[PDB]
Design a protein around this motif. Structure first.
Motif, short mmCIF file in Angstrom:
data_model
loop_
_atom_site.label_atom_id
_atom_site.label_comp_id
_atom_site.label_asym_id
_atom_site.label_seq_id
_atom_site.Cartn_x
_atom_site.Cartn_y
_atom_site.Cartn_z
N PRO A 1 0.47 -1.30 -0.21
CA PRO A 1 -0.08 0.42 -0.16
C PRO A 1 0.81 1.44 -0.47
CG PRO A 1 -0.11 -1.21 2.24
CD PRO A 1 1.14 -1.96 1.75
N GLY A 2 0.37 2.19 -0.38
CA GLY A 2 1.45 3.28 -0.79
C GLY A 2 1.02 4.45 0.72
N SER A 3 -0.02 3.60 1.53
CA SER A 3 0.00 4.53 3.03
C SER A 3 1.42 3.93 3.57
CB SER A 3 -0.69 4.00 3.54
OG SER A 3 -1.36 2.99 3.68
N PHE B 1 3.06 17.21 3.30
CA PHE B 1 2.28 16.17 3.35
C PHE B 1 1.38 15.97 2.96
CE2 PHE B 1 5.95 15.15 6.47
CZ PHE B 1 7.17 14.57 6.07
N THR C 1 -4.06 10.46 -1.07
CA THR C 1 -2.89 10.99 -0.84
C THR C 1 -1.52 9.45 -0.45
OG1 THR C 1 -3.16 13.42 -1.12
CG2 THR C 1 -1.43 12.94 -0.42
N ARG C 2 -2.66 8.90 -0.23
CA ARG C 2 -1.49 7.33 0.94
C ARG C 2 -1.30 6.20 -0.30
NH1 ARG C 2 -3.69 10.57 4.49
NH2 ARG C 2 -5.67 10.59 3.87
N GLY C 3 -2.19 7.03 -1.32
CA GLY C 3 -1.99 5.75 -2.92
C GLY C 3 -3.88 4.63 -2.26
N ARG D 1 -6.81 6.19 -7.22
CA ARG D 1 -6.35 6.28 -8.68
C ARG D 1 -7.11 5.65 -10.07
NH1 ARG D 1 -4.05 8.31 -5.19
NH2 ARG D 1 -1.49 8.63 -5.16
N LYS E 1 4.50 6.46 1.75
CA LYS E 1 4.45 7.44 2.45
C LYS E 1 4.99 7.80 4.00
CE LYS E 1 1.13 11.12 2.19
NZ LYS E 1 0.28 12.19 2.42
N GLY E 2 3.88 6.99 4.60
CA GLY E 2 5.03 6.53 6.11
C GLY E 2 6.38 6.53 6.27
N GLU F 1 -4.97 -0.66 8.32
CA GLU F 1 -3.75 0.61 8.94
C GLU F 1 -4.33 1.09 10.00
OE1 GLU F 1 -2.62 1.98 4.67
OE2 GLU F 1 -2.50 1.59 5.82
N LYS G 1 -9.25 -2.56 4.49
CA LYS G 1 -8.14 -1.78 4.14
C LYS G 1 -7.54 -1.55 6.18
CE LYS G 1 -5.36 1.22 1.97
NZ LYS G 1 -3.75 1.80 0.62
N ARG H 1 7.72 9.75 5.87
CA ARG H 1 7.57 10.30 6.54
C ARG H 1 8.44 10.61 7.41
NH1 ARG H 1 3.79 13.85 9.96
NH2 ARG H 1 2.01 13.69 8.08
N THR H 2 8.38 9.21 7.95
CA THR H 2 9.65 8.72 8.71
C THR H 2 11.58 9.52 8.33
OG1 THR H 2 9.92 6.77 8.15
CG2 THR H 2 8.48 7.58 10.08
N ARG I 1 5.95 8.65 17.73
CA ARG I 1 7.12 9.09 17.59
C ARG I 1 7.88 8.92 18.69
NH1 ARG I 1 6.40 10.69 12.95
NH2 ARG I 1 6.35 9.87 10.75
N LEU J 1 2.33 15.85 -0.99
CA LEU J 1 3.36 14.30 -1.00
C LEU J 1 2.59 13.17 -1.29
CD1 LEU J 1 6.49 12.43 -1.77
CD2 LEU J 1 6.36 12.51 0.78
N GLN J 2 2.37 12.53 -2.77
CA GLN J 2 1.21 11.53 -3.89
C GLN J 2 1.78 10.64 -3.19
OE1 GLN J 2 -1.27 13.01 -6.04
NE2 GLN J 2 -1.99 15.49 -4.94
N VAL J 3 1.68 9.22 -2.91
CA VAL J 3 2.40 8.63 -3.12
C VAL J 3 0.96 7.49 -3.72
CG1 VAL J 3 3.52 6.41 -1.82
CG2 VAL J 3 3.86 9.19 -0.99
N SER J 4 1.66 6.66 -4.68
CA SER J 4 0.44 5.31 -4.62
C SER J 4 0.43 4.14 -4.66
CB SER J 4 0.28 6.21 -6.10
OG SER J 4 -0.60 5.27 -7.25
N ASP J 5 -0.36 3.31 -5.05
CA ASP J 5 -0.50 2.02 -4.92
C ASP J 5 1.17 0.88 -5.78
OD1 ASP J 5 -1.64 1.37 -2.37
OD2 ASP J 5 -3.49 0.81 -3.30
#
Lengths: 135, 309, 214, 214, 125, 139
Positions: free
Chosen positions: B111-113, B137, C182-184, C187, B116-117, C120, C118, B120-121, C125, B140-144
């Motif tokens: 998964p793109g999340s 963020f 924005t987290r995948g 699309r 992305k995490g 998640e 899904k 992010r780290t 931190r 910043l778009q991430v995909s699968d």
């Protein structure tokens, strides 16, 4: 139309003042986390409480008959048990529900299964939201 | 402004992600000396136990312990195995297997999340107090990922190391090394660029290696201590992100600057005082095991390529 | 005359979208997908695709910077998606519709359901504490047939308006549709874009297909 | 002579319509749909359908350009939908009626209530803050049995009148009937369209029921 | 709407009284909140399957998943005694046999809300 | 028939005067918003307040009973909690409800449960919308 909470029969008219003094009770005497710290309830969890309540309200307003169907009673007791879960999660939410006696109101509306009692209870929760946002 | 890339992940070490499934000691798992672990599909097995000795097979499946991985498909008559989903190679040195993330079609993917995490780290090495209301963020778009094949998987067994490589009873189907994983990543250039990503990634990796990993590597280097030697200073090109296949506390936390030993002692006090027995600094790292000989590779370390459009 | 833009929206990722009035369970999915109540088909709202297309076009036709109200856009957006300024109210030429699922037969031919869940979380931190969640997305590979209506009210701007419509489609191929995009997820890609007329024969109708089918 | 135009309005999309005249809770559905106050089952007002059908025929029969007042439409539109010009006034031949939700048995057979709540929001472009709204739409597939009386004044003009009525119904099938129509609500579809005589027998009821039942 | 005497409008009260009967009269170390959570993470997948399902009569695959839930809860019951204490004290497997004896949608929804209420009042206490 | 606003009672002879005086209290010294600038309440929010009291006004005038019903008083207290909600949302509404003392007048009609009190409060609110549109409006 009556709704006995702890010692106070709240009827269809005095819900606003009682929600106001219930919110004003938590202010000027707030919750202590037992860690010493500086805490009070957020707005996201209390509006989660409202949008738990309002998932039944906007289906009740379809209905004209003053006798609530048993699936609506299932959903109202399900609201009660989800409030039990969320109060079990954090002591802030538990202390909120213990102070502003949501549990007593939800027991009363499960006791007297009528449309007017749930509309008054939803008005009480809604005025609790309103005077939390006002204060 | 809207710089789209193609992040290609090449797993140097094992990559494991999520799943939400904890496959039990008996639940659909069979490993023997041919070193495969078939996973049987879920409802077809019990609807096939519907049509032969129902209560008997239920009683057998609950009361054949302490042995069901091979014992009840060999001395019962379940010797036929057409109910598999796919095969996967294994790694010894016993049960409760975890699962790679799949869609409803069952193909593994990242998964793109998660990426992305991980990024992010990587970016939050500088500005550790990068607050709740961040503005980088949202752009910043991430995909699968691409749905990769079922032959890039191999079941590993994790190992932890302070003074001896102690086996642990946790099994996770990770990814094979040198697996190519295709993404796409976009952001606006007002707030971040690819060179910012590269220096942030390099800063995060060098701060992880120095002063906690190499300082604990110069200690406790024994005959099981020393592919896996350094992997940092050969080529800084092809940088490294960690995808969270049990990488550890140090990968997830990030308060680095300028804590060198304050970080180590605060980490030791925080982890040890609240959870388990209290030992000295450092605690441990986490390599893997795969025979014949165990190779000891670190989980999550990967390779990164960015090409435009 | 009135034109119908009929196409197909194939999903290449999840696209969780919308909110529902239905309850959740305690350990389960929170925030499910928006669905039609009768058919129990997962759904794309017309409002969601219209708002995302309008945001993608208005950011692009104004060169990247878009920090204004939707009644401050260029007029070649405002005659597509409407406007409500006090004096120059422009009736929208586009009429979006709620886009239901169309290939549930294909997905139950491939022996899967229409949606997934899904898993998640987020990580802190300081103490490395987790906070799990579940989000219900439609699976990838599910189509979404739609019929956008176009009011053919001026003939001199229909060609460049359909060029704008195609650009809004293709900017939506490069960007998510809704939910946690924005987290995948989210699309989307468009298949078989075509134009037909409601009743009658539009003379300049083959070259509109030449704009969309490009 | 009096004829009754009757049929059915099924909803392919949501169709939020109308306003109350009712209090709304805080986190809850703002702008509820109009309902018939006794049963309080959702309603299509006859005024809204008359206004939209009149708008569509007066726009289309003109040439497609409409900027005039309702009393400056064509002689056909003033013949059917009525007029109030000061000198040569016309009675409205069509009498519309309030239209109730009809197939509640079929919607309760699916165990869903007759109105849903559609969760929408707007996003600020400048500050990226949101603003949710909840609107009450009727559910799609929920039929609306209607009947309209046609005041038959001259035999030599009724066929053109019914051709224009069918043209208005076909135009109304390609737009929305009320509420937030450009965002994916309001789309209707007319079926079972038939014409019966109120009393007596019309000479040519076959050629009129052919037009609407084409 | 039977579900082993558990009416549709009192599942929370049944779970509340059952878990007040749990934490009073306990066994010797207590029950962890993890194994009941595993019970919930087993039931919720087929809850997710049924919650969007159209027809009233459940399919074979649903009851097959429910059966393997019985096999699994029997596995932790045989493996650990506090687990079987929970399954006999809170009438769980009687409710599951009731689900496969009715095979109706509302029966499984009521059962899911019951085990949901069990874990809710476990968090409450 | 009176209605205590702060301490200055309005009757059916001098309520529009105090509504216009309250509008000129809000105008000519408008609400500074802690951002620096001064804002005044929009017409849509104030007409929302007007339709909020008119949902009861539509049900009050068509009854002769000088004692208010229990359903009407329920909606009057509901008006109070809703106005208290909108006053908690944005402070531009809060300054309006403070200076045109909406909550104190709505308490006064909540206490003396009589039809003439709500009619006087409704004419006060209606006159207040009137002087909002007339004095210092955009029209």
């Amino acid at each position: 139309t009556e709704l006995k909470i702890g010692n106070e029969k709240v009827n269809s008219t005095n819900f606003g003042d009682f929600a106001e003094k219930a919110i004003r009770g938590i202010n000027h005497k707030p919750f202590v986390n037992s860690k010493g710290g500086e805490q009070k309830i957020t707005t996201s969890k209390i509006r989660g409480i409202l949008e738990l309540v309002n998932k039944v309200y906007n289906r009740v307003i379809n209905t004209n008959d003053v006798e609530l169907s048993e699936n609506i009673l299932a959903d109202i007791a399900y609201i009660k048990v989800k409030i039990a879960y969320e109060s079990g999660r954090e002591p802030v939410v538990k202390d909120f529900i213990q102070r502003t006696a949501f549990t007593a109101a939800i027991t009363d509306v499960m006791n007297q299964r009528t449309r007017e009692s749930f509309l008054l209870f939803a008005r009480y929760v809604e005025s609790l939201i309103a005077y939390f946002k006002f204060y | 402004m809207k710089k789209t890339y193609r992040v290609t992940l090449t797993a140097l070490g094992p990559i494991f992600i999520g799943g939400g499934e904890k496959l039990k000691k008996y639940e659909y798992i069979f490993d023997k000396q041919k070193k495969v672990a078939h996973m049987i599909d879920h409802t077809k097995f019990t609807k096939y136990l519907l049509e032969k000795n129902l209560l008997d097979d239920f009683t057998s499946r609950v009361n054949s312990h302490f042995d069901l991985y091979d014992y009840l498909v060999n001395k019962k008559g379940i010797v036929f195995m057409p109910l598999v989903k796919y095969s996967v190679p294994v790694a010894q040195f016993m049960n409760d297997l975890n699962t790679f993330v799949k869609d409803a079609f069952g193909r593994p993917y990242i998964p793109g999340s998660s990426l992305k995490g991980a990024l992010r780290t990587a970016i939050l090495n500088d500005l550790k107090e990068d607050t709740k209301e961040n503005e980088v963020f949202a752009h910043l778009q991430v995909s699968d990922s691409e749905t990769i094949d079922l032959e890039n998987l191999k079941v590993y067994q994790k190992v932890d190391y302070s003074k001896t490589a102690k086996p642990l009873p946790l099994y996770r189907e990770c990814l094979k090394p040198n697996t190519e994983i295709t993404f796409t990543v976009s952001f606006d250039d007002e707030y971040l660029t690819l060179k910012k990503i590269q220096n942030a990634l390099h800063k995060t990796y060098q701060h992880y290696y120095i002063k906690w990993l190499k300082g604990g590597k110069v200690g406790e280097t024994l005959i099981k201590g020393v592919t896996f030697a350094l992997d940092q200073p050969s080529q800084n090109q092809g940088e490294i992100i960690y995808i969270g296949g049990g990488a550890g506390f140090v990968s997830k936390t990030l308060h680095y600057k300028s804590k060198n030993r304050d970080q180590a002692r605060n980490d030791s006090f925080d982890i040890l005082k609240q959870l388990f027995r209290t030992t000295y600094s450092k605690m441990r790292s986490v390599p893997d095991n795969v025979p014949t000989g165990k190779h000891y590779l670190e989980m999550g370390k990967a390779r990164i390529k960015l090409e435009e459009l | 005359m009135k034109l119908v833009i009929e196409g197909t929206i194939v999903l290449k990722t999840g696209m969780h979208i919308g909110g529902s009035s239905d309850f959740s369970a305690i350990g389960a999915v929170a925030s499910p997908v928006v669905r039609d109540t009768l058919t129990r088909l997962p759904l794309i709202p017309g409002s969601s695709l219209k708002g995302k297309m309008r945001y993608l076009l208005a950011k692009e036709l104004n060169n990247g910077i878009l920090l204004n109200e939707p009644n401050n856009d260029q007029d070649e957006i405002l005659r597509l998606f409407g406007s409500s300024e006090k004096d120059k109210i422009r009736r929208a030429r586009l009429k979006f519709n709620d886009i239901k699922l169309s290939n549930l037969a294909e997905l139950e031919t491939f022996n899967v359901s229409s949606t997934e869940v899904k898993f998640e979380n987020t990580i802190n931190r300081k103490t490395a504490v987790a906070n799990p969640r579940q989000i219900e997305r439609v699976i990838a590979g599910s189509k979404f047939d739609f019929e956008i209506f176009y009011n053919l009210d001026d003939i001199k701007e229909v060609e460049k308006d359909f060029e704008n419509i195609k650009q809004g489609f293709d900017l939506l191929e490069f960007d998510y549709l809704g939910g946690h995009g924005t987290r995948g997820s989210g699309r989307i890609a468009f298949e078989n874009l075509s134009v037909i007329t409601a009743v009658g024969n539009f003379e300049k109708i083959n070259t509109l297909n030449e704009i969309l089918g490009a």
